């Protein structure tokens, strides 16, 4: 299966640059083009480049001729994607994309998960990760509710996964608040069955790329 | 360049719904992609009506030269997504601004949860109290946060979900945050919930320091 590995988050202070990897698998690297694509609320969907690892040949759209540089390492199978000079207006989410051939046409038939990368001058800040235990204030016929307090981080995104990802039923991850110091906060809960409560192991596993911080909390009664 | 409509279109299941897309020049194909909110886009139908693999047969794509669309036959809840267009026929490639689906079901009241500060974050000096509603319907949903029955005001924020592909719900969170010193100043901590589930407000509150 094709696929295509892509680092979290990027925190990049203005005036700076930033070097983003793309590790393509299930498939013969250099035999086929890859692709950049720009996601903001405002622009929408927008495509950067592409590059053959084949030779290492580069086409750009017009826009970012200046701010991306797409290389191509062809023993590694990673391409890479190097933005210059950043600014607000780079605040996105990158993808790397694979295209397909049918009809005479192309599409993109396999992205990568994406790197968001935030522009700001301000520091990172690793949350800290505070459990929301089950009660009995915390129960409803028959089911428990239960989570986790990422609290206090910067910037965006926070990731969580709930027993490593083997529990995704009930999971409500919510987006994340935005506090007055510029700082986020963010929750994640799970409603699970109040009888096994005494069996099963409840961790969330809490994710903050730009602050290197990987934590697993256990939320128990 | 590509336009679709409607931005947002509103959807029961299984109605049969249709959304277009509009392109400046004459275009070969136009490709669709479906995206949900977290998450990269999914191909969905490929060279104008051509189906991605695992996509129902529910879904299809229609349309030439410079109008296409994308139609479902009887939509269904996992349906809730941005849908957008894609053009490959000139450089460089653009899309669409995307058609939002929303899925429209009946009434459900909020389940709701409340949580104290856990004891590690008390030790920091801070307290966050946290209320929970659960799998509600419609969006709209009012949180009042009272302290020793006090209404409070500027000491909370609160997010809520995206709908959700299995029931069509949406869940929310308020987060009530105190410092120690003030948390530990009273004792009756409740989050008041108004929604249309609910003939009269729903209260879930604990008293600090009482297990």
């Known amino acids: 299966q094709v696929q295509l590995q892509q680092p979290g988050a990027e925190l990049v202070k203005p005036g700076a640059s930033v070097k983003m990897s793309c590790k393509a698998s299930?498939?013969?690297?250099?035999?086929?083009?890859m692709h950049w694509v720009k996601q903001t609320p405002g622009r929408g969907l927008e495509w950067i480049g592409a590059?053959?690892?084949?030779?290492?040949?580069?086409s750009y759209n017009q826009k970012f001729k200046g701010k991306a540089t797409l290389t191509a390492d062809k023993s590694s199978s990673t391409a890479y994607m190097q933005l210059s000079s950043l600014t607000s207006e780079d605040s996105a989410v990158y993808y790397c994309?694979?295209?397909?051939?049918?009809?005479?046409?192309?599409?993109?038939?396999?992205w990568g998960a994406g790197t968001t990368v935030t522009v700001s001058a301000a520091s990172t800040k690793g949350p800290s990760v505070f459990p929301l235990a089950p009660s009995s204030k915390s129960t409803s016929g028959g089911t428990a509710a239960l989570g986790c307090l990422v609290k206090d981080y910067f910037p965006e995104p926070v990731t969580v996964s709930w027993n490593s990802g083997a529990l995704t039923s009930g999971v409500h991850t919510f987006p994340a608040v935005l506090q007055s110091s510029g700082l986020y906060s963010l929750s994640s809960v799970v409603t699970v069955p109040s009888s096994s409560l005494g069996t099963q192991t409840y961790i969330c596993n809490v994710n903050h790329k730009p602050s290197n911080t990987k934590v697993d909390k256990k939320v128990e009664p | 360049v590509l336009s679709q409509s409607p931005a947002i279109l509103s959807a029961s299941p299984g109605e049969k719904v249709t959304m277009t897309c509009r392109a400046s020049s004459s275009v070969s194909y136009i490709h669709w992609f479906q995206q949900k909110p977290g998450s990269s886009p999914k191909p969905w139908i490929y060279a104008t009506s051509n189906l991605a693999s695992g996509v129902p047969v529910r879904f299809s794509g229609s349309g030439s030269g410079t109008s296409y669309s994308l139609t479902i036959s009887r939509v269904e809840a996992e349906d809730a997504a941005t849908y957008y267009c894609?053009?490959?026929?000139?450089?460089?490639?653009?899309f669409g601004g995307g058609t939002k689906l929303e899925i429209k079901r009946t009434v459900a009241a909020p389940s709701v949860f409340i949580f104290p500060p856990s004891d590690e974050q008390l030790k920091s000096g801070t307290a966050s109290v946290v209320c929970l509603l659960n799998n509600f319907y419609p969006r709209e949903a009012k949180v009042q946060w009272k302290v020793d029955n006090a209404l409070q005001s500027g000491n909370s924020q609160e997010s809520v979900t995206e709908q959700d592909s299995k029931d069509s719900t949406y869940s929310l969170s308020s987060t009530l945050t105190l410092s120690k010193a003030d948390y530990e100043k009273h004792k009756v901590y409740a989050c008041e919930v108004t929604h249309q589930g609910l003939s009269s407000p729903v209260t879930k509150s604990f008293n600090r320091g009482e297990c």
């Open positions: 299930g498939y013969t690297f250099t035999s086929y083009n």
């Open positions: 994309a694979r295209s397909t051939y049918y009809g005479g046409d192309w599409y993109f038939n396999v």
């Open positions: 590059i053959y690892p084949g030779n290492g040949d580069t």
């Open positions: 894609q053009q490959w026929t000139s450089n460089p490639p653009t």
